[PDB]
Design a protein around this nucleic acid. Structure first.
Lengths: 118, 118, 130
DNA sequence: GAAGCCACATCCTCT
DNA sequence: AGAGGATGTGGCTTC
């Protein structure tokens, strides 16, 4: 947990945590790097193991039936709200389009270095 | 044919739910029927609003008159009417001059719409 | 029955009209889900065509306006006070021949307006019914 | 507590 | 693989 991802993203314990804030929480946890990580290109990340992310998402949401199929539908709902977009052509690769730099307080390069993303 | 009187002595319209979910197709296709005589092809448009929403967002609020009947194919209400409050329909039959028939407290639109208590 | 017999009274009595007679606040309802820039070019260009969507904010009663009698410098005016538009258009509202009069700021896309009975057209129409 | 508002969770049709 | 429509579900806030 390099930095308080969900915290700086607006999450305040009040009510359920949102999917994008959850994914951010995973992308800032050096340990969750095997199934989800930054591609090194801005705020673009890729789920190297969709099923593992879904499982944890389900677990954090108490929705055991949850699978990547359902999770991706949550991401697609972000397209219009301009929070996360899809990288056309790259399988399981998405990108935050909101102002993460303001929320997190760090720039992509900085967070990558901090998270030692190769 | 379950029609209802409108605010105009020359027009009638089908029955609308008292409460309904926004962007949700209606249970029965909306219709506008002219008492007098209206030339086929005449356009008919619907609009809504009230003190909380001066102009609700609608979908497919246009129809053509045929045999004194204007069939609105999948008219949807997107704008919300407010807690407890209702919308005021404004039907407009484009003749020369154009005729307009209102219908106050026509329908209430909300996020969830009809829903059993928890 | 394109109109109601008590055309004159129906307007001088019923609340629906009385509250719309005063200089009520009006506003452009068109394309409310688009950049203000667009709503401006759309509203004006449409006015030059003799039509526009205006609603009485207070009561929330919307209306589709047709700026013509029965291009029209007389009704859709764009002179008086550069930047404004003093539109005008008749119509049969709830069996009551009336006329719409108001103005809108070519930038703010709103303004004031009102209604008023139509002696002449009411008469004519009242004749067609006999 | 009802009645709103949200962010999904589920299921599915189509490309 | 992935876009997006339809509709229900549980957390929370406002009336």
């Amino acid at each position: 947990p390099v930095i308080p991802a969900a915290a700086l993203a607006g999450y305040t314990g009040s009510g359920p945590i949102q999917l994008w804030q959850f994914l951010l929480e995973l992308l800032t946890d050096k340990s969750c790097q095997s199934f989800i990580s930054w591609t090194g290109d801005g705020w673009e990340f890729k789920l190297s193991d969709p099923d593992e992310v879904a499982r944890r998402w389900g677990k954090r949401k108490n929705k055991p039936k949850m699978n990547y199929e359902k999770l991706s539908r949550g991401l697609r709902y972000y397209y219009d709200k301009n929070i996360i977009h899809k990288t056309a052509g790259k399988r399981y690769v998405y990108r935050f389009v909101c102002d993460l730099q303001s929320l997190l307080g760090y720039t992509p390069e900085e967070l990558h270095a901090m998270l030692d993303v190769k | 044919g379950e029609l209802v009187r409108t605010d105009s002595p020359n027009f009638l319209c089908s029955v609308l739910p008292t409460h309904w979910r926004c962007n949700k197709t209606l249970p029965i296709a909306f219709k506008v029927v002219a008492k007098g005589d209206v030339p086929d092809g005449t356009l008919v448009t619907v609009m809504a609003g009230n003190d909380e929403n001066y102009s609700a967002e609608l979908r497919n609020a246009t129809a053509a008159m045929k045999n004194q009947v204007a069939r609105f194919n999948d008219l949807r209400f997107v704008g919300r009417s407010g807690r407890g409050k209702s919308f005021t329909l404004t039907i407009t039959v484009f003749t020369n001059p154009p005729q307009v028939a209102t219908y106050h407290r026509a329908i209430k639109i909300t996020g969830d719409g009809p829903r059993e208590p928890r | 029955p394109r109109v109601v017999p008590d055309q004159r009274s129906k307007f001088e009595n019923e609340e629906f009209f009385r509250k719309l007679s005063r200089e009520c606040e009006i506003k452009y309802t068109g394309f409310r889900d688009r950049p203000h820039e667009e709503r401006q070019t759309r509203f004006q260009n449409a006015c030059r065509d003799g039509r526009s969507e205006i609603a009485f904010v207070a009561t929330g009663t919307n209306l589709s306006l047709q700026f013509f009698p029965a291009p029209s410098r007389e009704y859709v005016d764009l002179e008086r006070e550069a930047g404004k538009v003093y539109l005008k258009a008749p119509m049969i509202l709830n069996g009551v021949c009336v006329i719409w009069k108001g103005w809108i700021d070519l930038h703010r896309l709103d303004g004031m307006g009102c209604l008023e009975f139509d002696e002449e057209r009411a008469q004519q129409e009242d004749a067609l019914a006999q």
